[PDB]
Design a protein around this motif. Sequence first.
Motif, PDB file in Angstrom:
ATOM      1  N   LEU A   1       0.811  -1.208   0.000  1.00 28.53           N
ATOM      2  CA  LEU A   1       0.000   0.000   0.000  1.00 28.53           C
ATOM      3  C   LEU A   1       0.845   1.259   0.000  1.00 28.53           C
ATOM      4  O   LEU A   1       0.394   2.312  -0.454  1.00 28.53           O
ATOM      5  N   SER A   2       2.080   1.154   0.478  1.00 29.18           N
ATOM      6  CA  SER A   2       2.907   2.334   0.690  1.00 29.18           C
ATOM      7  C   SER A   2       3.206   3.082  -0.602  1.00 29.18           C
ATOM      8  O   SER A   2       3.556   4.260  -0.567  1.00 29.18           O
ATOM      9  N   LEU A   3       3.059   2.389  -1.732  1.00 30.47           N
ATOM     10  CA  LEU A   3       3.310   2.958  -3.058  1.00 30.47           C
ATOM     11  C   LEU A   3       2.224   3.940  -3.511  1.00 30.47           C
ATOM     12  O   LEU A   3       2.497   4.866  -4.295  1.00 30.47           O
TER      13      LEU A   3
ATOM     14  N   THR B   1      -5.089   8.964  -2.321  1.00 28.96           N
ATOM     15  CA  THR B   1      -5.683   7.681  -2.726  1.00 28.96           C
ATOM     16  C   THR B   1      -5.725   6.644  -1.586  1.00 28.96           C
ATOM     17  O   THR B   1      -6.669   5.865  -1.485  1.00 28.96           O
ATOM     18  N   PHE B   2      -4.704   6.651  -0.737  1.00 33.19           N
ATOM     19  CA  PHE B   2      -4.626   5.731   0.386  1.00 33.19           C
ATOM     20  C   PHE B   2      -5.767   5.981   1.374  1.00 33.19           C
ATOM     21  O   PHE B   2      -6.308   5.031   1.932  1.00 33.19           O
ATOM     22  N   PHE B   3      -6.140   7.251   1.560  1.00 33.25           N
ATOM     23  CA  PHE B   3      -7.172   7.663   2.517  1.00 33.25           C
ATOM     24  C   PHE B   3      -8.601   7.772   1.969  1.00 33.25           C
ATOM     25  O   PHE B   3      -9.562   7.719   2.742  1.00 33.25           O
ATOM     26  N   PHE B   4      -8.751   7.964   0.656  1.00 31.51           N
ATOM     27  CA  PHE B   4     -10.071   8.251   0.068  1.00 31.51           C
ATOM     28  C   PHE B   4     -10.485   7.418  -1.141  1.00 31.51           C
ATOM     29  O   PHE B   4     -11.639   7.504  -1.588  1.00 31.51           O
ATOM     30  N   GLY B   5      -9.554   6.627  -1.670  1.00 29.87           N
ATOM     31  CA  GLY B   5      -9.806   5.861  -2.877  1.00 29.87           C
ATOM     32  C   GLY B   5      -9.840   6.790  -4.072  1.00 29.87           C
ATOM     33  O   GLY B   5      -8.949   7.629  -4.234  1.00 29.87           O
ATOM     34  N   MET B   6     -10.875   6.658  -4.900  1.00 26.24           N
ATOM     35  CA  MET B   6     -10.990   7.449  -6.134  1.00 26.24           C
ATOM     36  C   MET B   6     -12.421   7.920  -6.388  1.00 26.24           C
ATOM     37  O   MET B   6     -13.371   7.228  -6.025  1.00 26.24           O
ATOM     38  N   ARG B   7     -12.563   9.103  -6.988  1.00 25.60           N
ATOM     39  CA  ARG B   7     -13.853   9.584  -7.512  1.00 25.60           C
ATOM     40  C   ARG B   7     -14.061   9.072  -8.948  1.00 25.60           C
ATOM     41  O   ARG B   7     -13.092   8.774  -9.647  1.00 25.60           O
TER      42      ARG B   7
ATOM     43  N   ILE C   1       0.036   4.863 -10.035  1.00 28.46           N
ATOM     44  CA  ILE C   1       0.876   4.286  -8.988  1.00 28.46           C
ATOM     45  C   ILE C   1       2.302   4.110  -9.492  1.00 28.46           C
ATOM     46  O   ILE C   1       2.550   3.362 -10.441  1.00 28.46           O
ATOM     47  N   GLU C   2       3.231   4.809  -8.846  1.00 31.60           N
ATOM     48  CA  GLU C   2       4.646   4.696  -9.164  1.00 31.60           C
ATOM     49  C   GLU C   2       5.231   3.422  -8.557  1.00 31.60           C
ATOM     50  O   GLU C   2       5.383   3.313  -7.332  1.00 31.60           O
ATOM     51  N   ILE C   3       5.526   2.452  -9.418  1.00 28.29           N
ATOM     52  CA  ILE C   3       6.412   1.339  -9.063  1.00 28.29           C
ATOM     53  C   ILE C   3       7.764   1.706  -9.688  1.00 28.29           C
ATOM     54  O   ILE C   3       7.894   2.816 -10.210  1.00 28.29           O
ATOM     55  N   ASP C   4       8.767   0.827  -9.623  1.00 26.41           N
ATOM     56  CA  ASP C   4      10.088   1.082 -10.252  1.00 26.41           C
ATOM     57  C   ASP C   4      10.045   2.186 -11.327  1.00 26.41           C
ATOM     58  O   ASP C   4       9.146   2.192 -12.176  1.00 26.41           O
ATOM     59  N   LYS C   5      11.009   3.110 -11.300  1.00 24.12           N
ATOM     60  CA  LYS C   5      11.053   4.210 -12.285  1.00 24.12           C
ATOM     61  C   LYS C   5      10.865   3.706 -13.720  1.00 24.12           C
ATOM     62  O   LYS C   5      11.347   2.620 -14.082  1.00 24.12           O
ATOM     63  N   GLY C   6      10.148   4.488 -14.523  1.00 21.21           N
ATOM     64  CA  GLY C   6       9.803   4.076 -15.883  1.00 21.21           C
ATOM     65  C   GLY C   6       8.524   3.254 -15.988  1.00 21.21           C
ATOM     66  O   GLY C   6       7.781   3.388 -16.971  1.00 21.21           O
ATOM     67  N   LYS C   7       8.275   2.394 -14.997  1.00 22.75           N
ATOM     68  CA  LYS C   7       7.022   1.615 -14.932  1.00 22.75           C
ATOM     69  C   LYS C   7       6.025   2.116 -13.874  1.00 22.75           C
ATOM     70  O   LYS C   7       6.367   2.339 -12.709  1.00 22.75           O
TER      71      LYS C   7
END
Lengths: 90, 90
Positions: B28-30, B35-41, B48-54
């Motif tokens: 979840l830390s990513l 978004t962690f607190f409210f989700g999405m409208r 979501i940033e995983i490894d740079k570029g992806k």
Amino acid sequence: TEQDIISYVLYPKVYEQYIQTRNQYGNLSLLDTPTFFFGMRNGETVEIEIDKGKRLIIKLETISEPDENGNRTIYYAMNGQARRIYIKDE
Amino acid sequence: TEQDIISYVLYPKVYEQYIQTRNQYGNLSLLDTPTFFFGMRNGETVEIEIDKGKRLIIKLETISEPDENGNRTIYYAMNGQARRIYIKDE
């Protein structure tokens, strides 16, 4: 057809307004009466018998909230294929 | 790891509950904080940033009504691919 011709002669305004509807929605007489008058519920599946061995299987999955233009998105499934239609909420 | 071992020793119950969440939801830390607190409208796009570029590209289209067994359906687009999830409305 000849049937078209006296039909027009008998009902000029009505018949043209009929052809206008036919152009927009196709053959409505095939629909079941409940579907004709009320449409579909969320999650419902309707089967429209088109002809011998051919039918439209339609599922209404959800209707969305209206966008800024008052258009709603309807999520359908029809014969195994996802489908999205826009209707302006009057 | 050794870190697991000492973290469990320090906070047995909390560590165990942390593993359950990691098993259920992953890392979840990513997620960005809002978004962690409210989700999405509806209509929102979240990256979501995983490894740079992806990056994970998630779009929330709509949320259906709750069905007979209380489940709502969320219509997502993930990396440009339509996607459905079922969530219990509490």
